[PDB]
Design an enzyme around this catalytic site. Structure first.
Site, PDB file in Angstrom:
ATOM      1  N   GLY A 118     125.812  18.443  44.090  1.00  0.00           N
ATOM      2  CA  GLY A 118     126.473  17.433  43.277  1.00  0.00           C
ATOM      3  C   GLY A 118     125.742  17.052  41.991  1.00  0.00           C
ATOM      4  O   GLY A 118     125.947  15.956  41.463  1.00  0.00           O
ATOM      5  N   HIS A 137     121.875  18.721  50.534  1.00  0.00           N
ATOM      6  CA  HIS A 137     122.575  18.310  49.311  1.00  0.00           C
ATOM      7  C   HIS A 137     122.151  16.887  49.002  1.00  0.00           C
ATOM      8  O   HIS A 137     122.154  16.059  49.898  1.00  0.00           O
ATOM      9  CB  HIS A 137     124.096  18.287  49.526  1.00  0.00           C
ATOM     10  N   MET A 145     125.719  24.745  40.571  1.00  0.00           N
ATOM     11  CA  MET A 145     126.664  25.826  40.805  1.00  0.00           C
ATOM     12  C   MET A 145     127.980  25.533  40.087  1.00  0.00           C
ATOM     13  O   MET A 145     128.208  26.051  38.999  1.00  0.00           O
ATOM     14  CB  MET A 145     126.909  26.047  42.305  1.00  0.00           C
ATOM     15  N   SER A 146     128.834  24.683  40.671  1.00  0.00           N
ATOM     16  CA  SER A 146     130.199  24.500  40.152  1.00  0.00           C
ATOM     17  C   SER A 146     130.241  23.783  38.784  1.00  0.00           C
ATOM     18  O   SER A 146     131.136  24.029  37.979  1.00  0.00           O
ATOM     19  CB  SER A 146     131.093  23.762  41.180  1.00  0.00           C
ATOM     20  N   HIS A 165     116.792  21.480  54.189  1.00  0.00           N
ATOM     21  CA  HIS A 165     117.846  20.474  54.341  1.00  0.00           C
ATOM     22  C   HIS A 165     117.382  19.202  55.060  1.00  0.00           C
ATOM     23  O   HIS A 165     118.196  18.348  55.397  1.00  0.00           O
ATOM     24  CB  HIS A 165     119.041  21.092  55.091  1.00  0.00           C
TER      25      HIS A 165
HETATM   26  C1  LIG Z   1     124.097  26.803  47.176  1.00  0.00           C
HETATM   27  C2  LIG Z   1     123.924  25.416  47.744  1.00  0.00           C
HETATM   28  N1  LIG Z   1     122.946  25.087  48.632  1.00  0.00           N
HETATM   29  C3  LIG Z   1     122.953  23.780  49.014  1.00  0.00           C
HETATM   30  C4  LIG Z   1     121.961  23.223  49.983  1.00  0.00           C
HETATM   31  O1  LIG Z   1     122.009  22.009  50.270  1.00  0.00           O
HETATM   32  O2  LIG Z   1     121.140  24.029  50.471  1.00  0.00           O
HETATM   33  S1  LIG Z   1     124.252  22.901  48.252  1.00  0.00           S
HETATM   34  C5  LIG Z   1     124.820  24.288  47.373  1.00  0.00           C
HETATM   35  C6  LIG Z   1     125.985  24.301  46.422  1.00  0.00           C
HETATM   36  C7  LIG Z   1     125.817  23.221  45.355  1.00  0.00           C
HETATM   37  O3  LIG Z   1     126.958  23.308  44.517  1.00  0.00           O
HETATM   38  P1  LIG Z   1     127.314  22.300  43.317  1.00  0.00           P
HETATM   39  O4  LIG Z   1     126.340  22.277  42.156  1.00  0.00           O
HETATM   40  O5  LIG Z   1     128.708  22.828  43.033  1.00  0.00           O
HETATM   41  O6  LIG Z   1     127.410  20.919  43.943  1.00  0.00           O
END
Ligand SMILES: Cc1nc(C(=O)O)sc1CCOP(=O)(O)O
Ligand SMILES: Cc1nc(C(=O)O)sc1CCOP(=O)(O)O
EC number: 5.3.99.10
Lengths: 196, 195
Positions: B149, B124, B169-170, B104
């Site tokens: 995102g 993220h 993910m989403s 991160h």
């Molecule tokens: C499982 C996970 N890990 C993250 C990190 O920054 O380590 S962000 C995340 C979820 C990402 O979800 P979506 O594609 O819905 O944005």
């Protein structure tokens, strides 16, 4: 002689849980770490706190997380129903003492065959279709590895469990929900001695 | 030129439903990370049985967090959360595993490479996120998968900045049609490779 196992309650922040664990350690024989809803990162922080607080590592049992047991030098694991077989575990990590959580005569019989070292049987007093105390006696008669009773254990029920033949009991809320966990643990060990 | 597509399960669905989704999308993605943080070992092993009997290719599977489950299920790839096991520990006991770390910050990425991770997931990302991604890609020489995102319209910026892959993910598992969602990501990746 009857063993007393304390079972953590998956409800407290790690700092508070760590303090309680250090406090009750000389009143119990084993402490099972069963923080189901915490991540490995939080459980490793918990372990680091009790290790630096001086806990006797020989008393610790990891429920479910075989990987955390392996990388923390914890040598006892408790395997829930539907998880890994003791045979798989023992094939690669023969140094581990292995418990199985079982909920019927036949599952108890099968655990001994897959080479478990002991079983935890319950839930003894939950309203198993009322068959808890009788099954406890049947299981003890049929297998030759130790049987630890769990589910609703209180000081006033220990005679029934003892007469059924249990080799020990396991307690969660009776200690960790008390306003005074040390005293709570003492009530159990006093009752166990008085039965001698 | 090839960018990897990692689908990440969403820790929200009964195992029967999640199994069906995983089987339908398997040919549209490169990897599927099992990340059911709230489920027990018994439930996850039930999920794996359902997808093994459904015909899944095991080499696409990645276990998040649960190194014990990966090991006893003959899954060879694990993803390690921040604050959990170090890759060195894992590699001393199970040297056959491919090991990812979730990071991160730039400093955590640099450290992951020193502790011998094979690749990182950085997030993220979603201007500040993409810039940091770009800085990490010069700082370390193991692959970087971008997460956070990710949508089809953002894929060109991420790729131009140096990402070796993206994780979703989403965008997939919260869709009415997970296979059609996955196709939108793979079509856009293909166009970019050919253009
Ligand atoms: C499982 C996970 N890990 C993250 C990190 O920054 O380590 S962000 C995340 C979820 C990402 O979800 P979506 O594609 O819905 O944005
Ligand atoms: C942790 C556990 N396992 C059971 C089993 O049957 O496997 S019953 C139980 C909970 C025991 O809680 P308390 O001492 O508060 O009744």
């Amino acid at each position: 002689h009857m063993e007393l196992h304390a079972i953590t309650d998956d409800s407290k922040p790690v700092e508070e849980l760590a303090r309680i664990i250090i406090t009750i350690q000389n009143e119990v024989d084993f402490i099972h770490i069963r923080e189901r809803s915490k991540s490995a990162a939080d459980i490793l922080k918990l372990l680091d706190l009790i290790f630096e607080g001086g806990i006797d590592k020989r008393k610790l049992v990891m429920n479910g997380r075989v990987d955390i047991a392996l990388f923390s030098t914890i040598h006892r694991v408790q395997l829930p129903s539907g998880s890994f077989s003791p045979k798989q575990i023992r094939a690669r990590f023969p140094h581990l003492h292995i418990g199985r959580s079982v909920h019927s005569l036949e599952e108890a019989v099968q655990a001994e065959k897959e080479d478990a070292d002991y079983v935890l049987f319950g839930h003894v007093f939950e309203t198993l279709e009322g068959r808890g105390v009788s099954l406890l006696s049947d299981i003890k008669q049929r297998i030759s590895i130790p049987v630890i009773a769990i589910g609703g254990m209180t000081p006033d029920r220990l005679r029934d469990v003892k007469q059924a033949g249990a080799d020990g009991i396991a307690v969660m809320s009776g200690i960790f929900s008390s306003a005074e966990p040390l005293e709570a643990a003492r009530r159990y060990s006093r009752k166990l001695k008085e039965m001698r």
